Design a protein around this ligand. Structure first.
Ligand code: WE3
Ligand code: WE3
Ligand code: ZN
Ligand code: ZN
Lengths: 401, 401
């Protein structure tokens, strides 16, 4: 049930000592990563988010405004070019405000939701690395919301609704929520920290979410709501995070023209639902034990022949299935039929299509699943329509179960 | 007609001194970038390519083993972690071999086409940077093909066919081709360069492509076919590149089991159709002068109302168009209709939908475009149906236009 074993077991990814804590995404594993992007982007469109991309390193002088350099430079990778030092970004927060700073902003642009699949890098000790859970290079479904102090309620509520919306897709309904308060090493005034912590607390009571305080576990600049999901083994996994920031936008000279035609500093809301997408894939790998849902399966359908007589028929079906948007692979090897089914069952392919000579009239296929179920013969167009409903709805369970 | 100058007007991107030669992709520009990615991925599926992803840096010890460290030490960024050097990758070729190296490969796995949108970094001089044309961090539509020497066609013609097939979508068929031969400082025996240069030379005569030699301009490991396209201003732009490599796979301990059950070294073919996608977007920006085709437009349709009476009707239309897969924005601001139309016309939005009281009764919409042309009032379903017809085929030209 170990994702490292399943990942090697399913051709998902690999790692080696030349790049410690960094993922070599294979074709099958990268398909799952891209499928998660499509799912996230569908939510971004639904929740009216922009999608941007920032540069991969920046001047240390910029990281100096934020105080990020003071707290965690030891965790930061560094490079120099023409007597200037640059830091490979561990977070997308200052990159997003720079985009916000371009062009004069007004209150009519707020709330401004800006998201990015930012690939970050943190210099973690090699002894702390373990599979996809703890890595040096990871990708966040990061987003930062710029809004006025009157829009704080509505925007934080939208982030909370998004957390439960996406977690329910993967079947994670046991969620533990914690409020991380101020740490001993922080920046910002006491009264700022009071308002930010209270606002996060109020947002949770409005949505009727029980939670407990976690003293000293917040960021040095913002308190954060931490979402923890429980898998089918009742194991805690901390993925979600919503922070309320009144500090950084002021430090990075971010401003907008208000309703009263005056200088105001915008409130920034950090959010990340899945957290590290490499980590989230590892959670999904262990949660399903490699039995990914059909919409996430690297190979969704495998069509196999019994003899060479159906090799022409199988290739036609493989092309027809591929044209319908289904990830389908053809198994034309000269191996016994029980041998083929066992191999692809171990590959956790959701459906296996069997084509004998009895199939060659009928325009039909013998369907069997990775669970060992037999579904019998009927229409190829019917299975296409049956399947397409399954991927488009991102259903957790398969056909006839 | 300058891309940097249009790019500021259209919310495409921006750059600043904190990250010289690196792009801050804004929402509108990133839409074009992703929009090109889908087009490339459609070709990868068509031409049977895998898609992988490599880490951002690797142990320098490998960059010695390839010879890249000796030749291009000044152009590579370097960082430190636990008394070990890592280099932010300037190329994706050896990262692809690592994926190929995992698991024993045979001749039945060949040809193996592996593609990646690899984000590279080269330390180019800062006085040398200019907009999107010359950048420090760029994304290549890279791919490397592993095959036997008898397959040295079937892949090279596929690369050549892909070059002209993808260029025709953007309207580039004025293409001049050059063949770069061996430089004095290279690796491999002379007999490789005789076969490798000849293999590329015959392939161009094979495809009825006139070409000129560029003596001494090839890489230290491979001769290269260079594709140069000309825009509407008859300006040369060098984007395509196909390399024939017999050296590095041997240097990186890549091997496969042949038909005679003996270890063999696979041939590697470097290819890049668009080259740096940041550069290609800048070329496209200048080629169309900001008038991107509908399938490439960041915002495809803007629906505007005249008064608040049509505010419900436009919102229904925005949802219907958005559900149809059209990037649509609704303009409900309290401004005059002539003010709204002018703003989006300067934004080069392909189509603008106007809804008066006469539109909401009749169930139709008034459409007329960024160039000033009228389609009059047309059926709402008709406008959707034609648009999908326009986007799906990636047509260069407009609607009756
Ligand atoms: O703060 C954030 N998140 C934690 C933080 O900091 O680390 C937390 C996230 C994390 C993920 C993966 C790995 N990993 O090595 O696999 C380590 C750490 C954060 C949250 C939302 C938006 C933002 O813009 C953030 O910055
Ligand atoms: O050679 C290659 N491709 C051209 C080449 O060289 O430049 C061409 C592509 C390009 C254009 C612009 C910029 N840029 O800095 O904006 C960078 C790169 C190449 C092809 C395949 C694999 C490789 O490993 C390569 O190296
Ligand atoms: Zn943040
Ligand atoms: Zn290459």
């Amino acid at each position: 049930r170990d994702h490292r074993k399943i990942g090697k077991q399913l051709d998902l990814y690999h790692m080696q000592e030349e790049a410690p804590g960094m993922v070599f995404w294979h074709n099958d594993g990268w398909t799952i990563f891209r499928e998660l992007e499509v799912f996230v982007r569908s939510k971004l469109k639904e929740y009216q988010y922009q999608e941007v991309k920032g540069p991969f390193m920046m001047d240390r002088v910029l990281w100096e405004k934020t105080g990020h350099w003071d707290n965690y430079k030891d965790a930061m990778f560094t490079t120099s070019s023409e007597n200037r030092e640059y830091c490979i970004k561990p977070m997308n927060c200052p990159g997003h405000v720079q985009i916000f700073n371009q062009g004069l902003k007004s209150y009519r642009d707020l709330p401004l939701r800006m998201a990015e699949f930012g690939s970050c890098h943190r210099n973690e000790p090699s002894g702390s690395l373990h599979g996809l859970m703890r890595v040096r290079g990871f990708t966040q479904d990061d987003a930062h919301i710029f809004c006025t102090e009157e829009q704080i309620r509505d925007e934080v509520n939208g982030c909370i609704r998004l957390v439960y919306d996406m977690y329910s897709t993967f079947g994670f309904e046991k969620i533990v929520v914690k409020l991380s308060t101020r740490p001993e090493k922080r920046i910002g005034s006491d009264e700022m920290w009071d308002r930010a912590e209270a606002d996060l607390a109020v947002a949770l009571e409005e949505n009727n979410i029980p939670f407990e305080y976690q003293l000293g576990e917040g960021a040095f600049y913002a308190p954060k709501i931490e979402f923890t999901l429980y898998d089918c083994l009742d194991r805690a996994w901390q993925c979600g995070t919503v922070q309320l920031d009144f500090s950084l936008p002021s430090r990075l000279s971010a401003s907008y023209v208000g309703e009263d035609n005056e200088r105001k500093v915008p409130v920034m809301i950090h959010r990340a639902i899945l957290g590290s997408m490499e980590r989230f894939i590892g959670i999904l790998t262990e949660e399903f034990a490699g039995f990914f849902p059909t919409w996430l399966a690297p190979v969704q359908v495998v069509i196999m022949n019994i003899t060479d007589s159906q090799s022409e028929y199988v290739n036609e079906l493989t092309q027809k299935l591929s044209n319908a948007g289904i990830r389908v692979k053809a198994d034309l090897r000269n191996e016994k039929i029980g041998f083929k089914i066992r191999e692809h069952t171990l590959r956790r392919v959701p459906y296996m299509l069997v084509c004998g000579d009895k199939e060659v009239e009928s325009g039909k296929v013998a369907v069997r699943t990775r669970r060992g179920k037999d579904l019998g013969s009927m229409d190829v167009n019917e299975v296409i329509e049956k399947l397409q409903q399954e991927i488009r709805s991102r259903s957790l369970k398969q056909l006839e179960e």
